[PDB]
Amino acid sequence: YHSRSESSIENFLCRAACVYYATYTNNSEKGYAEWVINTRQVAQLRRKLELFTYLRFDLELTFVITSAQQPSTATSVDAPVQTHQIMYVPPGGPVPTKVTDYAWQTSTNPSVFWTEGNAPPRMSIPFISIGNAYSCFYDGWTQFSRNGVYGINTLNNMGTLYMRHVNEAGQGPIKSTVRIYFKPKHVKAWVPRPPRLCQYEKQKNVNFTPTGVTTTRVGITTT
Amino acid sequence: YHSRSESSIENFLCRAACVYYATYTNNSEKGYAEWVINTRQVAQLRRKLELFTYLRFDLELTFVITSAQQPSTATSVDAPVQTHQIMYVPPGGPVPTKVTDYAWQTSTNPSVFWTEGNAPPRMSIPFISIGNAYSCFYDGWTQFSRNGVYGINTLNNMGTLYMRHVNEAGQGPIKSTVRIYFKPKHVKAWVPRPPRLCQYEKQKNVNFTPTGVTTTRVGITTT
Amino acid sequence: YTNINYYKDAASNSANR
Amino acid sequence: YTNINYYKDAASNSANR
Amino acid sequence: YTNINYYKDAASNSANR
Amino acid sequence: VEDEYTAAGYITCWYQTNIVVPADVQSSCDILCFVSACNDFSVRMLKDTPFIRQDTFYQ
Amino acid sequence: NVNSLKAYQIPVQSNSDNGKQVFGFPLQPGANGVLNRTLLGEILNYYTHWSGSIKLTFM
Amino acid sequence: VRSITLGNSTITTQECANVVVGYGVWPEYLKDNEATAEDQPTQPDVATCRFYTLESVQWMKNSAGWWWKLPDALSQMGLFGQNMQYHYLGRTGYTIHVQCNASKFHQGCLLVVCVPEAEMGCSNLNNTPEFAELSGGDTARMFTDTQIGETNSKKVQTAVWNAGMGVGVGNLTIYPHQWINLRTNNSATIVMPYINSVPMDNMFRHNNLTLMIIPFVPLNYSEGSSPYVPITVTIAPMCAEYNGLRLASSQ
Amino acid sequence: VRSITLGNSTITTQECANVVVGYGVWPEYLKDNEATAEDQPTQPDVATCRFYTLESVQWMKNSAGWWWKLPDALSQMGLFGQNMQYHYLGRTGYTIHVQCNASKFHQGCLLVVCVPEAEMGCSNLNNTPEFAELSGGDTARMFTDTQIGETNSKKVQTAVWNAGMGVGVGNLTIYPHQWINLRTNNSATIVMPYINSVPMDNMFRHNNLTLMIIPFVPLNYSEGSSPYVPITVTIAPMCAEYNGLRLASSQ
Ligand SMILES: CCCCCCCCCCCCCCCC(=O)O
Ligand SMILES: CCCCCCCCCCCCCCCC(=O)O
User: Fold this and answer.
1) Residues ≥6 apart with Cβ < 8 Å to B102
2) How many Cβ contacts (< 8 angstroms) between chains B and C?
3) How many CB atoms are located within 10 Å of the residue H60 CB?
4) What phi and psi, each to the nearest 5 degrees, are found at residue H127?
5) Which chain F residues are closer than 8 Å to B144 by Cβ?
6) Which N-terminal residues, if any, form the signal peptide (chains C, D, E)?
């Protein structure tokens, strides 16, 4: 007589979660931002995903982009509305090195242009793993000699996001922050794993500092 | 030949009413707002609900968010459009302690991001009581010893709303006010109760100061 | 339109009138 | 509407609920 | 919707996929 | 979360008779307790757990 | 005992008296340290309401 | 003419006494489809479903009114109180019978009203009333024709015209009620079902019902008539149910 | 392997425990054709028909035996005692479960016997024993391996070999009984019906049953084995019935 609908894997994971945010200012040629895509830089979504060993899902991407006026000396700063470009560069593709780089032509790379004041941009991504499922944990190495990189980072080859101001700089600098939100959809999960107990320490491995199993009480009969 | 459609419980209660409003300024790390959700801080909706002892309804939530420019000393203040975040924290969940808190990742907490100049944000909420109906009055205590808290406040465990500016502060402070509007829908009511006569005094109890039953007239025959 | 529910949850529906 | 896919890709569909 | 051409010109149609 | 309005009670264990052992057997023993939900269990109102937290992004 | 496996061990021995208490804890699967960090308790801390029987096994 | 028998106790009324039944709902046992507790309920029946007579009060010429909190008023009555002490949960209806007889040379009118969830206000605005002020078990708590001062830290605001709930006393007729007019009647009988937002509840921490008797027209008589007019309240639990049998609670 | 559930209480035995059923009669409610009281009986069921555990006793090497008077032993046990206090008449069966566990390196044998109408003799021939000597409620009364002197004015003659009834102790097997041999068993279960010359009786003035545990072979063990071996008695009323509801009796 009580349904378990809200404890489904879908309902548990199909909620948008911030995975990273980056900043960039319009006052330099290096005024762009980059982020190597990964789900291990935030505690909450990482812990939710790491309840399982293997996952297979589609992804909904939503960006929240906000700007702030930086100090300036010009009288009467009056800036038009700002337009932003976010470009996805799959591994092996050319990467931008400056705001006015030729790589922003995005002839084949998927890119999104969005103007401030509108609804947040949003796009969908399919399951893009070379394997049959995403891996949350990998007890192995990248090299056949068992030297070098050990762990889950060997399987992270998902590419890089690049972000920049489209508008040319005006009479005052503008600093913008882009917040990236991941929402898994059509999720399939396998091999449940104990929830993470020790606090996370690093992005690329499972390193931890030992912590007690629970909080304590005075005696075995204390209520 | 005269219909009673407009005196239905639905029509009587299915009108949006302000239940609270909070303010927050972008000039400090403590520049966020919180509100423990309750329908007893405003006279009108409280009186309308308290015509009955038990209620069961869905809720439509609408927020009206406005901002005002605060005094500043910088010349030529030119601020971009502001984006706000409202996060719901169910009881037991971690609560933010600053604007840049990690809790704003909202990986599982429901949150809404809204930019100024657009239509007011709006969401629907089902009937979320642990009981079979909401209670407007509770003649009892929270402790089995009949000590401590007495009254309706024992049953209020609905959680907390948190509000903040998403944008980083610019060259001048901005103060924002968020007005919360409740609209019950699909309402069911039971045990009608006499309308509240004495003015309300406190949020968490029915305390009152005695007042006359009606206004007065000179004599029993005065017309 | 006249009456079509756009959402999968009953709480999303309009008022009972 | 009630349920109509607007896109040609399955990844564009809403959640499985 | 699923697939309906809104314009009278073939060039207005979406890509062939 | 803890709330007196929804107190659930207490679980206690007591010696019904005694632990009795022969000679050359350790009298001190240990008991392991396991917990799990039954078939009628359910949960509601998803929220963020209070067991994981952060101060900066993990590098 | 929380930084070892002694946390899971419930002592028991031969007594010289009767009806002594072995252990006792509140039935608070989501808020009490005894049950907070088990599988059930960890699943519970992602939610706000719970309902159902609890299976306790002692070995 | 009409006799109502419950267990081994019987009361008698006129054949046209017009018993008032709650909100039109007769008391009934909890159905399986709306029960949440899983243990088998205890239904003592004859041992608990019987008429209990509380202490009588005197209707004086200046009496303002009286009230009883229903589950608490029977907390010390036979096996009903014992089951209350030994069980964590309980639900029950009631049959409230109020008796007040006077001669044809007397006059007066009483309002007998059963108020669900009668949350009461405190004389001190910053506090809530204490248990002793809110209920006296068998003993009746008295309304006051004056206003309780704010000095009193934990007393109930007992002004009759607001009925301790910040409402209009004349509007109390919305709750199930009967009028005892000495000209016509000498008793009132109200049958009330179990009214709550949950199928079962704790009988000590929650007072589901409150019985109020308020004289709207004061008692009066001429010299020579009997000056002592008591009011006697007899209450019978109906379809009392219990769950969660454990050790007895101290209260 | 085998679990017996009564109310909210459960006991466990071996699948081949061989429960002894009285005189072959299972406890049952009083039938209408053999009832004399006319009032409707009270049948509390789950609230009273459950396993109650009395205080444990220690089986010592020189222990002579123990006894409990059945209705008196449960006079302070939950709602069963409350119903006993509030009712003039009552009838009930019992399920007596005696527990005594020991290692395979222990030896000893007990006789667990239920004796109807166990009228006991006094140490002083001209007197009868007092209530305190005849019964200790939950506390067990102890048999003695010696003979009580005639000086004692109102004590029970507790010589084991006569079992306080002027009979042969080895002939007690005529009453429903079970043997607890530590070599084979660790528990005994005897289900006894209501046995009386009248359909119902007063539970305070008449002790219908007496449970005796008498060690025929003394407990023994070698040095090193656990020396403390308790005996725990758990009793559950079966089909308890009551009549004549009135005010509570002081006793
Ligand atoms: C403007 C277009 C943006 C396109 C962005 C494409 C994002 C690549 C998809 C990333 C999938 C991450 C899967 C995580 C796997 C894991 O759980 O370890
Ligand atoms: C961004 C998401 C916002 C979600 C907000 C959830 C609001 C919780 C629901 C509150 C219901 C209040 C019911 C009132 C009960 C009463 O009448 O006493």
Assistant:
1) A43, A44, F53, F54, F55
2) 28
3) 13
4) -120, 175
5) 4, 7
6) none
